[PDB]
Structure formats: structure tokens, C-alpha cells
Amino acid sequence: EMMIKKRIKQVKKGDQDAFADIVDIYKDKIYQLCYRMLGNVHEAEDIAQEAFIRAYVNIDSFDINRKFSTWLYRIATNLTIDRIRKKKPDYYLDELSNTIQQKILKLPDKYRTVIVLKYIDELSLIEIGEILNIPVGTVKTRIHRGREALRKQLRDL
Amino acid sequence: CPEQIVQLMHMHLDGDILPKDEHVLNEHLETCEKCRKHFYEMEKSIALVRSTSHVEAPADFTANVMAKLP
DSSP states (O other), rough: HHHHHHHHHHHHHTHHHHHHHHHHHHHHHHHHHHHHHOOOOOHHHHHHHHHHHHHHOOOOOSOOSSSSHHHHHHHHHHHHHHHHHHHSSSSSOOOOHHHHHHHHSSEEEEEEEHHHHIIOOOOOHHHHHHHHHHHHHHHHHHHHHHHHHHHHHHHTT | OOHHHHHHHHHHHHTOOOHHHHHHHHHHHOOOOOHHHHHHHHHHHHHHHHHHHOOOOTTHHHHHHHOOOO
């Protein structure tokens, strides 16, 4: 977008106030992604901030050729997948919305991720592919599997 | 329900069915009640998941982000 990229040029030259504009634009969606991935207010908030802080600190390595939201979504996505895995106790050895949230957590994180981006966040199969760094064909598979596991959890609500 | 028509169900939901294969799927639903219940469960689930898209960041989120920058 013209608004956003003009804001990114401004932060890279010193304007930290331009970055707050970027945070304000994406905070809801990024926090939404983290929260629907983790199911936990304190973890989602921590991870969502970490996403933006890391976005700022790595901003001179971002190609303005490419879409900024993809890049930011990818940071947040990697940070949340990271926490879900290290949450598993043995990692280091080698209401209605609320009810659907608990079901979402029972999905393996590869299908959880595509379901959240597709159905809660309304992103295209193309952008998901770029976000996760996989071809559109692979995304479709995971969506199909995710849909299936999701149907098992939700059909009786 | 056979797996071959369940693949068509997913192709409808992806929004890339061929119009030749769109008429194939409708035949199985009305007739095959096992494939009609399966598709109903998926659409019902998709509809409940979409109703969880209301979440906004915490009140002071961007102040807290600005405070943590190097």
C-alpha cells in the first residue's frame, strides 16, 4: 500500500512515530492471529509485541519490492508456531467464541495456522503460501486436512 | 460417503470447481445422505469458526510496543 510503504521509508530514516502508525494498522489482526493460535491473553500479547519489535529491528532487511503484511505475518506466524512447540512439555528432550477457541487448539499447528489465516483472518491462498513459504498446492492440502479435523470438533456445537 | 466426491466438496469450498464438476457434486448430496451430512457438518463448522473474528488488541498495545524498541 501507498500509505504503508511511505511509512516504512520514514522509519528507516529515523521517524519512530511513523512505526506507531504501522502498529496501529496491524495490531488487531496480528494480536488476533496470535490469540487464536495460542488461546491465551498473556502469551498472545507478549508474542504479538515481539512480532512488531522484531519487525522494527529487522526493517532495513525488508525488501520494499514485496508486500509488508506478508513479511509481518511471517514473523508473527513463526513466533507463534515456536511457542506452541516449546510449550509441549518434552520439547527440549530432542461461551461460544471461547468454546470454538478450545477446539481450534486441538488442531495440529500446521492445520491450525492455515485455518486461522483463511477463515478468521480472511487471507488468500496465495498470501498464505508466501507467508508460510510453501506453494499454493501444499496450502490447499493443509486447509483440506484442517477443515476435516475442524469438522470433527465443531459439528455438535 | 466415497472420498472422490469429498475432494469435490473441498474444491467447492476453495472456490475453484470446474463448471463441468460443479453439476457432479450436487447429484451426490440430494441422493447420498452420507455425503449430505458430511458437507453440512463442514459448512456448519466453517460458519462457527468465522464467528471468532472479532478480536482487537489490548487497550495500550502500541504504547507498550513503542516502549520496548531499541
